[PDB]
Design an enzyme around this catalytic site. Structure first.
Site, PDB file in Angstrom:
ATOM      1  CG  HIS A  62       9.696   6.899  -0.664  1.00 47.17           C
ATOM      2  ND1 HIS A  62       8.598   6.121  -0.988  1.00 47.17           N
ATOM      3  CD2 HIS A  62       9.029   8.035  -0.790  1.00 47.17           C
ATOM      4  CE1 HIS A  62       7.506   6.790  -1.409  1.00 47.17           C
ATOM      5  NE2 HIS A  62       7.778   8.053  -1.040  1.00 47.17           N
ATOM      6  CG  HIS A  92       4.136   1.736  -3.702  1.00 46.30           C
ATOM      7  ND1 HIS A  92       2.733   2.275  -3.526  1.00 46.30           N
ATOM      8  CD2 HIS A  92       4.291   1.048  -2.689  1.00 46.30           C
ATOM      9  CE1 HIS A  92       2.314   2.006  -2.459  1.00 46.30           C
ATOM     10  NE2 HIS A  92       3.118   1.463  -1.483  1.00 46.30           N
ATOM     11  CG  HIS A  94       7.078  -1.501   0.758  1.00 44.93           C
ATOM     12  ND1 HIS A  94       7.275  -0.331   1.191  1.00 44.93           N
ATOM     13  CD2 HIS A  94       5.673  -1.557   0.735  1.00 44.93           C
ATOM     14  CE1 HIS A  94       6.117   0.592   1.188  1.00 44.93           C
ATOM     15  NE2 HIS A  94       5.039  -0.226   0.848  1.00 44.93           N
ATOM     16  CD  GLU A 104       5.484  -1.548   4.222  1.00 42.34           C
ATOM     17  OE1 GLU A 104       4.449  -1.397   3.357  1.00 42.34           O
ATOM     18  OE2 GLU A 104       6.030  -0.506   4.339  1.00 42.34           O
ATOM     19  CG  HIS A 117       1.600  -2.131  -0.793  1.00 40.97           C
ATOM     20  ND1 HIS A 117       2.343  -1.650   0.274  1.00 40.97           N
ATOM     21  CD2 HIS A 117       1.418  -3.373  -0.355  1.00 40.97           C
ATOM     22  CE1 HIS A 117       2.643  -2.233   1.171  1.00 40.97           C
ATOM     23  NE2 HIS A 117       2.125  -3.514   0.996  1.00 40.97           N
ATOM     24  CB  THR A 196       3.432   0.913   5.173  1.00 42.15           C
ATOM     25  OG1 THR A 196       3.691   1.017   3.821  1.00 42.15           O
ATOM     26  CG2 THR A 196       2.488  -0.037   5.388  1.00 42.15           C
TER      27      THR A 196
HETATM   28  N1  DHI Z   1       5.732   8.708   0.561  1.00 42.40           N
HETATM   29  C1  DHI Z   1       5.200   9.493   0.932  1.00 42.40           C
HETATM   30  C2  DHI Z   1       4.045   9.908  -0.454  1.00 42.40           C
HETATM   31  C3  DHI Z   1       3.557   8.756  -1.069  1.00 42.40           C
HETATM   32  C4  DHI Z   1       2.127   8.280  -0.814  1.00 42.40           C
HETATM   33  N2  DHI Z   1       1.986   7.271  -1.607  1.00 42.40           N
HETATM   34  C5  DHI Z   1       3.018   6.952  -2.037  1.00 42.40           C
HETATM   35  N3  DHI Z   1       4.010   7.907  -1.717  1.00 42.40           N
HETATM   36  C6  DHI Z   1       5.410  10.928   1.339  1.00 42.40           C
HETATM   37  O1  DHI Z   1       6.499  11.323   0.972  1.00 42.40           O
HETATM   38  O2  DHI Z   1       4.906  11.640   2.522  1.00 42.40           O
HETATM   39 ZN    ZN Z   2       3.254   0.445   0.165  1.00 40.87          ZN
END
Ligand code: DHI
Ligand code: ZN
Ligand code: HG
Length: 258
Positions: A62, A92, A94, A104, A117, A196
């Site tokens: 994602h 990361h 967005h 965001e 972020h 988020t």
């Molecule tokens: N994207 C979140 C895990 C995540 C936390 N921070 C970045 N990614 C999830 O799959 O629930």
């Molecule tokens: Zn973020």
């Protein structure tokens, strides 16, 4: 099924599995500049990224995460509305499928090309996992990205995305200095919020810089070449992985400047 960013698994479906999606301090939010009030008591913001130790870049399906080594006080956020020390664990982005969307948080409803972020966790809690069980466990430095001139310190990231096109892939991304992603000014707005993405934990103190950085079209473009899918699967380009603004409710946004 698993949460994502589509007509069937996007933000508007997250509450079913993650009820807190309709909570009291969710993020992001629109920043109304003519309502946020300057806080004369905020101490100067301190962003010390000198001894940062990047370890790896990872496509999680994602977004992509540039993970840092946080087993010691190396990269720390402090000052501002923060009490104590917060360690940089990962950063990361967005972004949108079009320069007209992606970020965001929004400023007076204006949407940026993308949003960076840097996630930090309050050291008083020992680790990220424990920190995400506290009202003040996290601190995220949000930096808006706008399309224009290329950002030198961001090219290493761009050139490496080729090796992590699909979900699951992770390439060694050692020695990346996050200081090359910081705008000139540190003026910011701050409010209490959440992450988020699910589980959308309401543990964040948001520090959103007013000054956006500008990256080239060719740069953001390659961000758009990524895939949400895993290798050897129908290709779903990684675009528009941003959550829309949520209700401000009973919160107040404070400006670090007048
Ligand atoms: N994207 C979140 C895990 C995540 C936390 N921070 C970045 N990614 C999830 O799959 O629930
Ligand atoms: Zn973020
Ligand atoms: Hg929390």
């Amino acid at each position: 099924h698993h949460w994502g960013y589509g007509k069937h698994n996007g933000p508007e479906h997250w509450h079913k599995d993650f009820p807190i999606a309709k909570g009291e301090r969710q993020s992001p939010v629109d920043i109304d500049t003519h309502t946020a009030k300057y806080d004369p008591s905020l101490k100067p913001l301190s962003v010390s990224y000198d001894q940062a130790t990047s370890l790896r870049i990872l496509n999680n399906g994602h977004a992509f995460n540039v993970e840092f080594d946080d087993s010691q006080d190396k990269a720390v956020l402090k000052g501002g509305p923060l009490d104590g020390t917060y360690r940089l664990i990962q950063f990361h982005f967005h972004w949108g499928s079009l320069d007209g969307q992606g970020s965001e948080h929004t400023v007076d409803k204006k949407k940026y090309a993308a949003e960076l972020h840097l996630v930090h966790w309050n050291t008083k809690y020992g680790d990220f996992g424990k920190a995400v069980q506290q009202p003040d466990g996290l601190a995220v430095l949000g930096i808006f990205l706008k399309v224009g001139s290329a950002k030198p310190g961001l090219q290493k990231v761009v050139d490496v995305l080729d090796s992590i096109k699909t979900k699951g892939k992770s390439a060694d991304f050692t020695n990346f200095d996050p200081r090359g992603l910081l705008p000139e000014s540190l003026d910011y707005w701050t409010y209490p919020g959440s992450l988020t993405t699910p589980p959308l934990l309401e543990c964040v103190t948001w520090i959103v810089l007013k000054e956006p950085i500008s990256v080239s079209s060719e740069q953001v473009l390659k961000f758009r070449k990524l895939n949400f899918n895993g290798e050897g699967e129908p290709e779903e380009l990684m675009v528009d992985n941003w959550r829309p603004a949520q209700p401000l409710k009973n919160r107040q946004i404070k400006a670090s400047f007048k």
